[PDB]
Amino acid sequence: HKIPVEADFLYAYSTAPGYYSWRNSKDGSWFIQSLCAMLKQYADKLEFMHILTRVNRKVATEFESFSFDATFHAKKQIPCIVSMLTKELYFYH
Amino acid sequence: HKIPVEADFLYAYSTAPGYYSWRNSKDGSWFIQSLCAMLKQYADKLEFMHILTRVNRKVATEFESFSFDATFHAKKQIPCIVSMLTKELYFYH
Amino acid sequence: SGISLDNSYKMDYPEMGLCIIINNKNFHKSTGMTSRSGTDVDAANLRETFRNLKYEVRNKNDLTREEIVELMRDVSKEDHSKRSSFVCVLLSHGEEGIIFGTNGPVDLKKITNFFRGDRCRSLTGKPKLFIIQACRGTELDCGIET
Amino acid sequence: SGISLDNSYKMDYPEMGLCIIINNKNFHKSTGMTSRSGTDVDAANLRETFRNLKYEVRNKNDLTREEIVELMRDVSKEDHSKRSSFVCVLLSHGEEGIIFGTNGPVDLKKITNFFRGDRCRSLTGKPKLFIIQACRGTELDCGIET
């Protein structure tokens, strides 16, 4: 007769717990860039979790930092999908 | 040419961050009970994230605690899917 | 009617819902936080992307910790009965579990709590999406060659 | 050959992979941790469920914090070249980010770090699944009537 008060929440984090999140001053953040591109291409075709998985792959494979500072050079990033959803989510019907 | 070292990990948490996780001494934990039931019924039909979403709904709707202690009575639980995966995962091929 | 399955959220309400975008680029000097160059590119990209998904987008720029909490509280107090879902995008500096207002931190839990199933009745049973573009710490992923 | 898409993990390797189940029911008195009644039901259910998915299941019972770390390290040192994935199930008491050995805590990060893309080369690019049945704090969800 009840559902958890924390149910039906989805947290699409740009990066894994404890990690830095990369941004490109000209193109925007790696995550948002990728998220919008995947939503534009798949929002009318794939379930949300599957769209976000594509975002994970895009960020993970197509981006790598470049820095004169060795500490911040050649770094990578993986987004983090946190789902407390109870149903599949399609932006179309 | 590289992928994040944290990529391709999936954490299927029985409960949301900061929350208690319920167990029934006779039937087993709410989460594992539900996870095995959904894998048994959908592992040869649905993508893993979708199976886990079914697990979220099952735990969220079919379970509620009963306790003589008001503090622990009538409580609910929502599992927490944390995905750093970069592809869809099907247990079959 | 025929067999009815409820495996997908009902997304055919009159409205898809709100898409609140909080874009923090400039921070109070006293915080010692640097400007987030390029964040406007993200903000614009999201506005257009969600506009095409039929979401009622509302962009908010450079909000203090006080204004973020006030905005979220007010939004959670709206009647979302005719809306299918809710989306909130946060663009700012951050740490694990924290998003930064222009003058200080805000616990993500405080923001999301306003939308709990028992605190925002018109969203109970509906998907509540929070998209967070912010650091969750200082760790750097060195990656591995494939 | 025709168009090739790589949207799904390759799960047709000779072996599906290992399924390590750590079932902690009895804890050292000194810890003051109670026994986890019914956990054997979970352990057996998982063993059968993953057996039917063709995973090489290995059940381990009542492991100390030292034994958990040793087991994970050793497993990560195996050659998983012919395996499609890796699964680890943890059944025990816990707190946010922590899983309890029978005599003390183990940081989940320490366990998962052994399997990082750069530390377990034979699993690089393959799905690594960690299923955690343990508390992540003491909060209780009062729920909301629907």
Curated annotation (Swiss-Prot), chains A, B:
Taxonomic superkingdom: Eukaryota
Record PTM (Microbial infection) ADP-riboxanated arginine, positions in chain: R23
Effect of R23A: Abolished ADP-riboxanation by C.violaceum CopC
Name of the protein this chain belongs to: Caspase-3 subunit p12
Residues of the full protein shown: 185 to 277 of 277
